Structures are given as C-alpha cells and as structure tokens.
Amino acid sequence: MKRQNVRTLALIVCTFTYLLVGAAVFDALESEPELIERQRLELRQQELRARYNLSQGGYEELERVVLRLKPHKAGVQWRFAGSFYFAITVITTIGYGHAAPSTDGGKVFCMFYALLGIPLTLVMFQSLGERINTLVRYLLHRAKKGLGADVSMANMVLIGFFSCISTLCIGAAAFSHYEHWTFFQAYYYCFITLTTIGFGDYVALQKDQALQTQPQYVAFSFVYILTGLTVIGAFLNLVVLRFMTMNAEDEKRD
Amino acid sequence: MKRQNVRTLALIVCTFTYLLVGAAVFDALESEPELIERQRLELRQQELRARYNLSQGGYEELERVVLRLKPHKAGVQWRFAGSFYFAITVITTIGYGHAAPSTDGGKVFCMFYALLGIPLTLVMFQSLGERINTLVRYLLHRAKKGLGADVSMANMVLIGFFSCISTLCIGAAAFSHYEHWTFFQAYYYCFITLTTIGFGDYVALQKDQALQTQPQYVAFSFVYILTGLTVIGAFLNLVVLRFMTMNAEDEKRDAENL
C-alpha cells in the first residue's frame, strides 16, 4: 500500500475509534444525570399542573408560547448589533443558534453569505495568523540576541499553546464578570466559542438587553471573538496545517 | 509594504466590510418580522395567563420547567447513539447544542475531547478529501483517454461544485422525508450542517425517538454527515486551501531571493 493510502486509512480508523471511545465516556458521564433530571422535572411539572389547575392541553398551549418567546427573552436580536453578531457566527462557523433566520429570504441570503463568507474568513484568519507567528518568531529572535539566537519549532509550539491558554483565561475573567457566570462556565464558553463548536448553551450579549443598551461590552465581545480566533487560527497554522498538505506532497513525490 | 502585509490588510478590510454589508442585509430581512412576531407572542402570553388564572410569578415558575424539559422532549439524548451523535457534533465543530454536557465532568471531558479531536478530524477530512480528488482526477483521465487526456483545474472545480450540489440534494431528499420538513428546510439544514455552522434550529434524529427506535435512519445520518463533510472538505482542499499556504510562500521567496 502507498504511504497516502496507509495514512488516510489510519486516520479513518483513528477517528472512528475516537468516536466509539467518546460515545462510551459521554454515556458514562451523562446517561444517569439525564434520566435523574428527566424524572425530577416530570415530578416538578406534575406539581405545577396541579397547583394552578392545568390540564394536558392547557399545559401544551402554554408550552408553545414559552418556547417561542425564548429567542425574544434576550431582547431585539435582529437590529444592527444583533445582525452583526449573527454575521460573525455565520462566517466564523460558530453558529450558536441563539438567533437564526426566521424568514425564507433570510435563510437564502444566509446560505449565499456563508458560501463566500467562510472561505474569505478562513483565508483571512490563516493570513493574519501567519503574520502573528512571523512577528513572534522575530520578537523571540531579537530577545535571544538581546539577552545574550535561532527560533525552533518547539519554542513556537510552547508560545502558541500558552497564547491560547492566555486568551481563554483573559476571556473567562471578563465574561465571568459581565455575564455573571462562574470562571469555569465562562472558560467553557470561551473554549466552545474559539473552537467554532458554538453549542449555544452559553452566549454573550443576551443578559439585560446588552446588544441595545451596552455598546462598550458589545465592542469587547466582537474584538475578543475575532482576536481569539486568530490566536487559535495561528496555533492550527503552526501545528495542524502542515499535516493537511502532506497527503498532496507524497503524491507530488510519486 | 510587503506583498504579505498588503494581502493580510486587504483581507481584514474585506472581512469587516463583508460583516457590515451582511449586518445591513440581515437587518432589512429580519428586523420587522421579529418585531411583528414578538408583539404577536406578547399578546398570546397575556391571553393564556388570563385563561388559566396565572400571575407574573406563576408563569415564571412554569417558564423554567418548559425550558428545562426542551432537551428531554426529543427523548434520551445521552445513551450510545445519542453520545455518538454528540461526539460527531464536537470533533466536526458542528455543535448543534440540542444536547450539551449538563455535568461539570462532562464539560471538562468535552474540552479535552475537542482539543485532540478537532485536529484529528480536520486532518482526516483533508487526507480523505485529497484521495477522493486523486480518484476523480484518475477516473476523468481514464474517461478522456477511453472516449477518445490531461485533467485541468477548471474540470476539477466543475466536478467539485456539482459534487456539493448533488450531496445537499440527496440529503434534502432524505431529511425532508424522515424529518417531515420542506425540501428547502432540509436543504438549509444540510447546508448549515456540512459548513459546520450548526445553528441547531434544525436537528435530525429528534422526532419520534429516532435515536432509540430507528437504527437504520441513525446509521444513514452519521454516514451522510461524515461523507458530506468529506465532499465539502475536498472542495475546500481544491479551491480555498491553495491561498492559505500563499502567505508562507511569499515569506519563503523573500529569504531565498535575498
């Protein structure tokens, strides 16, 4: 078998085993708490339905309204600040889903916007990420020469990994302050955001109508998401991007 | 200014103007409908509170229960199938958020799982994506030679773009059938899924306890998500990936020439 064919199959076997292992661990950690919570909420639902004289249909009618009012609870999510925050979540592929296009026209424009947007954003983050690495490589060379000079890959991975921890922790500190979350919750939010996972379980600019009433904080969250993604982008550019071109290099060598 | 510095600044200016333009269009398309819906829902809330003799506190107590029961409504989301589906959404960066770790330990393991997972998944999709492109390049060369032979970039972009359309169309055909959505809704779901955006407004395997009762459909969904991402991955590898290494090539050209 060819080196590319061995590498590709190894990666497929790795990913599928990583999924089985993950599924096994996530089962062990979340199965029983979910079954416990489901039973606890069902009892809490039966108590409230009895307390306010509510039937099966009566509860269901109130259920639809509460669920439909959830995206409105955070406030106006579609003015300039709301649409700019949403535009970020699309092109950066975070996509929290806190605000999603409710109209057919909005859904169409969103698809075309992403089609051209995501490549533009990826290229931009890899270009800016490279310039940051080139600056760090120069600064470290000047530091080595200054103190009393060659910058290695290992030195770059070290600065890179610490740069990532620094941005998650700086973010965590500020989001635990403004969103009134624990440092762990704000750290988990920052991790899920900057890895473009964006579950939407934690979303910034949702409390106390921040998108409309807090301009300073909306400006910070926009700056952090974009700068933070460049730090993660620069780390992938250094560690991960080299292995992607490797498959084409071996075919070029053939 | 250096070519790299001009290119990087141009891209920053491009992205920020693309954001302003996007924000302007999304405002024009969604602002008024949202106000109309908020008003309509604000009236309904008041109507039902009056019908069933509910106070401000009484509604708020029922509000917490309805919101907390939302992830449970779909059924069991954390057994083997549900955890495997969740594991996909993490490492592929789709992250619908239909199911999210409710425990502190689950949140910790998820972070470590993503840290090593996302690079492994990205590398895997670019490696498998390249093999698909190499196979297409060989098949098209054999077809040109067979019918009556060089495979150009333009020929590859054409096959690539059509490979994206057909995958979304095959998907929309299936998800509109099983998840009882319109072709447009299922197509929009497939687009948002395969671009790793994953808003979570549309999530497959939630209706009629599909994760537990429908193993045949679950098997298809996992295979479609994974194969579909390889098709999108192969297209990015062909068109977009050639521009990312460009910034390093110009810096390599600076040191070599001087």
Ligand SMILES: CC(C)CCC[C@@H](C)[C@H]1CC[C@H]2[C@@H]3CC=C4C[C@@H](OC(=O)CCC(=O)O)CC[C@]4(C)[C@H]3CC[C@]12C
């Ligand atoms: C903290 C984050 C950003 C770092 C995560 C580590 C990655 C750099 C690792 C995780 C999985 C690794 C891959 C797992 C499996 C393989 C197959 C392996 O293939 C072989 O050994 C057979 C072919 C050959 O010998 O070339 C080559 C390395 C590679 C791509 C690995 C390259 C490095 C990867 C992407």
Ligand SMILES: CC(C)CCC[C@@H](C)[C@H]1CC[C@H]2[C@@H]3CC=C4C[C@@H](OC(=O)CCC(=O)O)CC[C@]4(C)[C@H]3CC[C@]12C
């Ligand atoms: C490379 C970096 C360091 C600089 C990038 C430029 C920033 C200074 C810009 C880019 C996006 C801008 C934001 C885009 C949108 C808004 C919303 C805007 O709020 C409203 O319009 C409120 C009313 C509404 O919702 O319509 C206030 C300014 C702000 C935060 C902007 C502040 C300035 C920002 C952060």
Ligand SMILES: CC(C)CCC[C@@H](C)[C@H]1CC[C@H]2[C@@H]3CC=C4C[C@@H](OC(=O)CCC(=O)O)CC[C@]4(C)[C@H]3CC[C@]12C
């Ligand atoms: C359907 C999808 C897969 C295709 C999306 C199109 C992309 C291939 C486009 C979208 C934005 C484009 C970028 C927009 C701006 C620039 C800056 C531009 O810089 C200059 O012209 C100045 C420097 C120089 O002359 O080298 C170089 C091309 C580049 C990176 C473009 C490369 C091609 C991109 C990524």
Ligand SMILES: CC(C)CCC[C@@H](C)[C@H]1CC[C@H]2[C@@H]3CC=C4C[C@@H](OC(=O)CCC(=O)O)CC[C@]4(C)[C@H]3CC[C@]12C
């Ligand atoms: C190269 C590609 C086309 C092949 C990849 C291998 C597939 C055949 C595997 C990979 C993941 C597998 C799935 C992983 C998880 C499940 C859930 C499992 O369902 C349960 O365990 C139900 C009860 C529970 O929820 O725990 C049934 C098999 C199925 C669909 C598996 C069927 C076979 C799949 C699609």
Ligand SMILES: [K+]
């Ligand atoms: K989401």
Ligand SMILES: [K+]
């Ligand atoms: K993503």
Ligand SMILES: [K+]
């Ligand atoms: K998401």
Ligand SMILES: [K+]
């Ligand atoms: K995402």
